[PDB]
Symmetry: D2
Amino acid sequence: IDPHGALAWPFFEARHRELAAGIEAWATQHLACVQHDDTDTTCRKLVRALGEAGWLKYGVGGAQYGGHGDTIDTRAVCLLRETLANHDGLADFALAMQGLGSGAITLAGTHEQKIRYLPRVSKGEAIAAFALSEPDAGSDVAAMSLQARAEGDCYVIDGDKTWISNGGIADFYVVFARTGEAPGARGISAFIVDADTPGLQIAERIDVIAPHPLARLHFDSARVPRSQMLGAPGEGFKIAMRTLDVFRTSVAAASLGFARRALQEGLARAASRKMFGQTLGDFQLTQTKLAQMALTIDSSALLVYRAAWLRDQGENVTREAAMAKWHASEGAQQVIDAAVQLWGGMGVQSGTTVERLYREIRALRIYEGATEVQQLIVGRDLLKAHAAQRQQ
Amino acid sequence: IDPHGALAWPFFEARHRELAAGIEAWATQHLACVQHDDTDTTCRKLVRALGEAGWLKYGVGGAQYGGHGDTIDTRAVCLLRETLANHDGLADFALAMQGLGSGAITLAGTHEQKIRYLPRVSKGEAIAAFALSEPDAGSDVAAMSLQARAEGDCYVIDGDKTWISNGGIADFYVVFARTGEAPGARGISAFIVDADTPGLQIAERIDVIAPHPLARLHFDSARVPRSQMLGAPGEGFKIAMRTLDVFRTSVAAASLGFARRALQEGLARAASRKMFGQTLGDFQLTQTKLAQMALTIDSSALLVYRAAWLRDQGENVTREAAMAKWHASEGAQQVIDAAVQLWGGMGVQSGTTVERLYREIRALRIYEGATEVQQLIVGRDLLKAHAAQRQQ
Amino acid sequence: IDPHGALAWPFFEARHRELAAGIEAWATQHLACVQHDDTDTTCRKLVRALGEAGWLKYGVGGAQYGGHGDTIDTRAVCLLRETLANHDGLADFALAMQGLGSGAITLAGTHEQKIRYLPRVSKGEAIAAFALSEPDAGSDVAAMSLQARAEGDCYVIDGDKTWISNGGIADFYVVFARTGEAPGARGISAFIVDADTPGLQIAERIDVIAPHPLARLHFDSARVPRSQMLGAPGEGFKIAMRTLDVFRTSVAAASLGFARRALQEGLARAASRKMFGQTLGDFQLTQTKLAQMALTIDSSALLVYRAAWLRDQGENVTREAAMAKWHASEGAQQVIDAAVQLWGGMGVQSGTTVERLYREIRALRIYEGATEVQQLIVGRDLLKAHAAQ
Amino acid sequence: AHHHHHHMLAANLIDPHGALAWPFFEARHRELAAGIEAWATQHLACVQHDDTDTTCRKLVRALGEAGWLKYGVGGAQYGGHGDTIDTRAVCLLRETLANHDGLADFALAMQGLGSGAITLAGTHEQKIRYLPRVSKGEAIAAFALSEPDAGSDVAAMSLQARAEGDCYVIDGDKTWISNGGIADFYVVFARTGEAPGARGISAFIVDADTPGLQIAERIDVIAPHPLARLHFDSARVPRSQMLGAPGEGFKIAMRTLDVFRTSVAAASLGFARRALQEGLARAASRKMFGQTLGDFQLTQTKLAQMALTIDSSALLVYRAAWLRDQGENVTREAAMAKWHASEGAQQVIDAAVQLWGGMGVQSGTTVERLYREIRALRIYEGATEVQQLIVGRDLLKAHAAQRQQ
Ligand SMILES: Cc1cc2nc3c(=O)[nH]c(=O)nc-3n(C[C@H](O)[C@H](O)[C@H](O)COP(=O)(O)OP(=O)(O)OC[C@H]3O[C@@H](n4cnc5c(N)ncnc54)[C@H](O)[C@@H]3O)c2cc1C
Ligand SMILES: Cc1cc2nc3c(=O)[nH]c(=O)nc-3n(C[C@H](O)[C@H](O)[C@H](O)COP(=O)(O)OP(=O)(O)OC[C@H]3O[C@@H](n4cnc5c(N)ncnc54)[C@H](O)[C@@H]3O)c2cc1C
Ligand SMILES: Cc1cc2nc3c(=O)[nH]c(=O)nc-3n(C[C@H](O)[C@H](O)[C@H](O)COP(=O)(O)OP(=O)(O)OC[C@H]3O[C@@H](n4cnc5c(N)ncnc54)[C@H](O)[C@@H]3O)c2cc1C
Ligand SMILES: Cc1cc2nc3c(=O)[nH]c(=O)nc-3n(C[C@H](O)[C@H](O)[C@H](O)COP(=O)(O)OP(=O)(O)OC[C@H]3O[C@@H](n4cnc5c(N)ncnc54)[C@H](O)[C@@H]3O)c2cc1C
């Protein structure tokens, strides 16, 4: 109970303070030496262990379906990702994808669809995936071209998805395809596609700078039953956006966890590195660099948990979640870059904490709405609200 | 109550939401056309009007001395300055100086000293001033050279103070002078010096870029009874620092108020300025510029009221208040600068709102602990806490 | 000759080194205590004194018309503005407007037009002005609404221009007006409008944060002879843009001069301000702030004089001049802001050098193509060149 | 009037908007830039990053055979291009090589840094023995200065050199040593004890086969290349192998880093230019929202800032290199160039990664490699903060000199 800790803020309830201590204790006991050599196996083990400890319940909505509660506790999910990321980006990834990959089912699935998938997801017995981006269309989601033609009681799916997290190890994929009811964003549908669907191919595994399971998927005329559709034909675009919206602040929270770890490493190095008859921390320039790192972190944390608290009041957080993800991810890049600088040569030595952080942060500014997209979201929302106030 | 408004945050209590509406109503009624030509007269009028409306009680400690309560409600003082600064810098100045100028009496006065000065300050019937800085020493307070030499039951005060807000119109000054008990910061004493003390002269008024009452004071062997000392001989330096600490977040809150006004002006101009067949707000560069203004404002506001909330819980806020004053004042400069840019030539036209803001914000980064000093305070506190953690 | 000075760079020739020494000596003698109380009178005196000393010849093209050479020496004009701004923004302003206000005549005048106006401009005997912007159209020049209507052998001008530098003291205005040959940027024409033209009204003097002569002009059916048109009907937009192109790097040079003055003041204060048992300059943070000021200054100066040198080789400088004006004006704001900070309370005291610089720099990021417009010019040019390559 | 160029322009030998047209350059620099670009396009089409020991050995030999290692060596009779190092030439070589492949830049750069102390402080006999092979690419050079406990603080190094008879006995460790494990000799800086601190250092030429020299471990960094920790177990080297006088090793170390200060900045610029090329290509071809990525204002102004940073860095680099080539000290100008180019290249590369989206962080893309190749150039040969202090202190030193005069 540190009065200066962020957990003392009135954005949090007692259950969040208890949860934060619980996931930190679990992370210390389980993430001391995570093997990045075989990430497929490591992710499978992480999902199982997270499931067994109860941590995957918070990303699922509906207690009867294995959820922690009938709504998703945004503050809890943020605290889980922030803590896991502080310890190991792969553990954060494994928990995050159980939420994002199943979220469309929480939001739009029928009773039987929820019963079939969400208990196993919440227990860590099924690995989930979210398949939206394509080679020619990532930011421009509304122009996706994965085809889903109706034929009988099923849909025949043709084309590719890429950058699919958990690609190759997921037990099912929530897949968004163009069914063609109307142009652009109005002709998309969403499907639950089991990994063993005939016609579903793992076309290639993708290597990124922070390695984790990632694949390009090819659909070779795959037939999935119409009963596997989430929502109504043409409702897929709003389902995708609503799913991303649930977890947007928790992406910001993961960035914050990486940033906090970078400051931990920068502080330890400043305080211990002897140089020029003193320590690195005795120089003004080091002190103000650390101060800016802490300022950025506190700003990020306040924005993250303002947005999560506000969503947990039942409000839409279009502007506040965009601010948090933008600020936390860009801020984490700045904090980590400063920490690398503080560590000197060791800062770029393979395997060190700050060097791994330098790789884990970079992609978070790109996916789930690149920084530029977040800025536009906030700007347009400001002008939208100004216009509404004027029309009153 | 706007669920997206900052007042909904649980940093605030019900009384703060009522106060925020009340001071906004007062400002709307009373600040419609503030006269910047004769600031002596305007400030005297503002102090009286704020006092009569009860708004000066919040910067005074002790109900029996005219204060709102026995302790300073820092969240309330911040809301007062944020609102007043959002309307007019002179109104914020007038309220702020009644707090800063009397705070050493709230903190260190005897009962008789508090009775003689604080009720009039709280009623707006006596204008307060805080005289610490000198021509040769502003940042380096511990080396101040105003002399106070004991003589019988009085002190003979000799030398200058300068940059003194309300100088020339104040009814009293809290003055810090070297009495010499020990070197440096341990040789300073604090005095209440009535403006009619023989030998206290106004050497000159001072013209600054955002004009307001300001003077160089010449103590020309001015004799002050020993009974006008605040505290014990040699305790003056701590009284000065503790007085500044009380109001540090409120300086951040004034910066935030100026920044909010700038975003209001920038938004109105973006939405209404037709150009290139559309409006200025239709351009991406405008939208991302506005988004960054709002992000800096929300970060600043969260830091201000986190710090104020935490201090109101009875905790020291050395790190949090420095973060707030630093981030809000530097942030407001950037927001205001962006609003000037959006307004084009009108942004530098004398008397327009954003042109005034460009002048009003600049000194806030300099006084009450320049930005560079705030950065060092945060950085040294980070290393102090880190060393305390390592010892454990 | 300081080997570390920018004048030693091979962007410059001997005549530029000699010019820089001459204008610096003139400024040191004539700008020791410029009066900002009555800027109309001060500008009139500055124009005459600059003209008498020969410094206004560099902004005029053609020796028979009073100019130094047959073309405008961009490096020379930049060095003049940089030096004058270093000393006093009003002196920089006075010289700058003699160039900008007369440039369209240098560029597009007939022999008779150049004879009538350029000798007087070069001698400081006619104060020039450039009237382009309007209340509803500044950045969006192509949409201007000042109207020029052909009637017999004259044009009748109705409407407003605003933000007009030297408004109220200029002897003539180069005015751009819609003649309507085609929509938008293709229906504009340029006119020389003498200040004594009946119907031309000084509607309002404008006060800005760094004051200087500035007015809104109202044209109440002002009749100007067709022979006062600069160039052909419909050529006005190109003439306005080409005139701004000529002097664009010299706005960057003025910004650089302001920045250099800010560093001089910041260095002087750092070295002499005693605090905490040492000087302000002994702190790491002061040393790195000073370092960043100097780095921004050298990068701006290299960009300014690269662009000016390139234009003086007879080449277009669309990208390079935009880089210079963008970088130098935004950079000068940062350098000046850092100098204000080093001076503490004195940094915001009216009348100190750094306080004046904080006011003098701000408009330069707005006029003659705001920073955002310069950024788009550069980015579009990069993509244009890439599409060819 | 006068134009800088005329007849060569008429011969279509000069691009007037190119940086090579700047009067900071002579005709020989334009020729060299064209030659090294031709060599790079021919020889660097598919650099293998799997076995960097073998690739670097191949690169050094090929660069030497083509004459490009002569520019980093001083003294024509010893294989150098001229009697002094042509700074502008060495910058152009690194800028071009870095633009193509960081390992080719590395291989050339280390031939210069590794032999630079021999050029500056070597006796006639020392230069004859080492510099011809270096300049031919027949000997791989290395520069052994940093220690686990002392990198920025060179004056605090603890490697020991003990005089014994007419030899010196060396004990202790060096680390972060580029070309460690493949070098034929190391210039080693060790404390000999003539005086405390920066005055008790001496420089030695230490052949790789010197008994007692051990390659303790190979170091893996985010942009992999030959790197090792060296351990000296009572290594005996003759007093004749000392570079300069006893106690002069600190000045020799610092002057060698000075000779090549602008050249690291020039490599940073080559990486940044490549990032802009990739950014423009992606912006012009990536279709989205019914137009291209380059049609958005944000993309245009981001590209504009990338080019602005590049042009500012290039002007700073070649201003400094030109000035040093006139025989002047460039304490302030070279520190500006290294600080700005390295921080600037990081920003340019980061922007190019962002323009490429997911592919920006996909292993093997050009921009992903650049994001890794750039990071260490901000840390070594004077971390950014050290350069800032050099500039700020020089400003104050010059200001004080004027106040006296
Ligand atoms: C580690 C990693 C994991 C991923 N996991 C998944 C997953 O699980 N499921 C899934 O569906 N996708 C996933 N993705 C894909 C990711 O969502 C996309 O990369 C992202 O949507 C950007 O799309 P893109 O790569 O096609 O870049 P592009 O669409 O080509 O955009 C490139 C750049 O253009 C900028 N930009 C975009 N829009 C605008 C605009 N209007 N105006 C100005 N600039 C703009 C942005 O800076 C953007 O980065 C993952 C990506 C990565 C790197
Ligand atoms: C509008 C205005 C109103 C004011 N009202 C009052 C008042 O009512 N009562 C009163 O007592 N004073 C008042 N002041 C004075 C103000 O507090 C001082 O200006 C401030 O303390 C700075 O002191 P200085 O002006 O002497 O600057 P200096 O002490 O000379 O410092 C100049 C710069 O040095 C930098 N600096 C300072 N310390 C360090 C450090 N350790 N390391 C690195 N850099 C450092 C800072 O950037 C600082 O701005 C006012 C000032 C202004 C502008
Ligand atoms: C001291 C001063 C002196 C002046 N002297 C003269 C003179 O002598 N002659 C003359 O003709 N004019 C003069 N002007 C006018 C000046 O050129 C205009 O103010 C300038 O062109 C901006 O036009 P505006 O004020 O109407 O702002 P707006 O056109 O309304 O633009 C406002 C902001 O919009 C942004 N913006 C503009 N275009 C874009 C775009 N495509 N995309 C995104 N953002 C954009 C910019 O940040 C701009 O500042 C002067 C102005 C000043 C301040
Ligand atoms: C790829 C790579 C290759 C290398 N190759 C060689 C080689 O061939 N030969 C060789 O001798 N060395 C080599 N090095 C070592 C390199 O020179 C050192 O890492 C560098 O000198 C920094 O020293 P350090 O790592 O001990 O960090 P530290 O000395 O501990 O400094 C850490 C950080 O503290 C900051 N700092 C330093 N001084 C100050 C100051 N006065 N004030 C404020 N902040 C300060 C800086 O940001 C610095 O980066 C290499 C390093 C790398 C990453």
